[PDB]
């Protein structure tokens, strides 16, 4: 029952008023899950790994950090977000002259 | 690349250039390799012709753009010009963005 | 002409329009013309097409010259746009003669 909010689509199965500031709970909402994607895309919410942060010696032990963040490296393989029928067909790639895998 | 431009795998390629030794009077046979040469220099004239593709601005912008311009306040000298003693002026840097589109 | 612009002993010629008179209810014969017609407007779209000829520049100058910019300082609106009534604003009077040629 953990999501990660702020990686979600979320839906109204009603249309709204416009400017409407009104309190929306669970029930009401139409919150997406991404779970099939999971045998090859990271969770969220939790650690990415552990990478070393110092040299070992006699002296010293060896040690480890763990991190909150990483970006594309070669041999990455990934799954992209799932169509929805309440959900957008397109978008526009925007004029920079550079960009990176349009999706 | 990082300082501008266009990257190119073939690039226009090196161009090299030598004065031909011309010796110093030798009198006896050595194997040694001779050390002595008469002392020249050469001097001539280059030329470079290249040829460049356009692509045309499509704007449906209303209003007047920012464009360069020669604008200076109470000028004492010509700038891109040379000076009473010869020297050529350049003061400002110029860049290529002027015009804007739409993203 | 003095105002300015290209005098012509043959100028596209004058095109007049007019609503037709139409007459309110005459339930008795006079010489004397009809004076009481029904109150009418008219309304529509005009499109003009023009074709001009152009001359190029040809100029051996090696420094750069002076050109009309859109260039303000601090604006707190745009100029040759709309307002937030929708009145458009025309500050400034616009010339040709940017462009320079040895006598």
Do not use: C
Request: proline share 10%; hydrophobic share 30%; aromatic share 10%.
């Amino acid at each position: 029952n953990t999501y990660a909010l702020e990686n979600t689509m979320i839906f109204n199965s009603q249309p709204a008023n416009p400017g409407t500031t009104a309190t929306y709970l669970e029930g009401n909402m139409l919150i997406t899950s991404e779970s099939e994607t999971q045998p090859v895309n990271r969770v969220a919410y939790n650690v990415g790994g552990q990478m070393a942060t110092n040299n070992q010696s006699s002296t010293t032990a060896p040690a480890t950090g763990t991190y909150n963040l990483q970006e594309i490296v070669p041999g990455s393989v990934w799954m992209e977000r799932d169509v929805y029928l309440q959900g957008p067909i397109w978008a526009k790639i925007p004029e920079t002259g550079a960009h990176f895998h349009p999706s | 690349p990082a300082m501008g431009g266009f990257g190119l795998k073939h690039p226009p390629p090196m161009m090299l250039i030598k004065n031909t030794p011309v010796p110093g009077n030798i009198t006896s046979f050595s194997d040694v390799p001779v050390s002595s040469f008469i002392t020249q220099y050469s001097t001539g004239q280059v030329t470079v012709e290249m040829e460049w593709e356009l692509k045309k601005e499509n704007s449906k912008r209303w209003n007047p753009e920012i464009q360069y311009t020669n604008n200076y306040n109470d000028p004492q000298f010509v700038d891109f010009a040379p000076d009473s003693t010869g020297e050529y002026r350049s003061t400002r840097p110029i860049g290529t963005r002027y015009l804007t589109r739409p993203l």
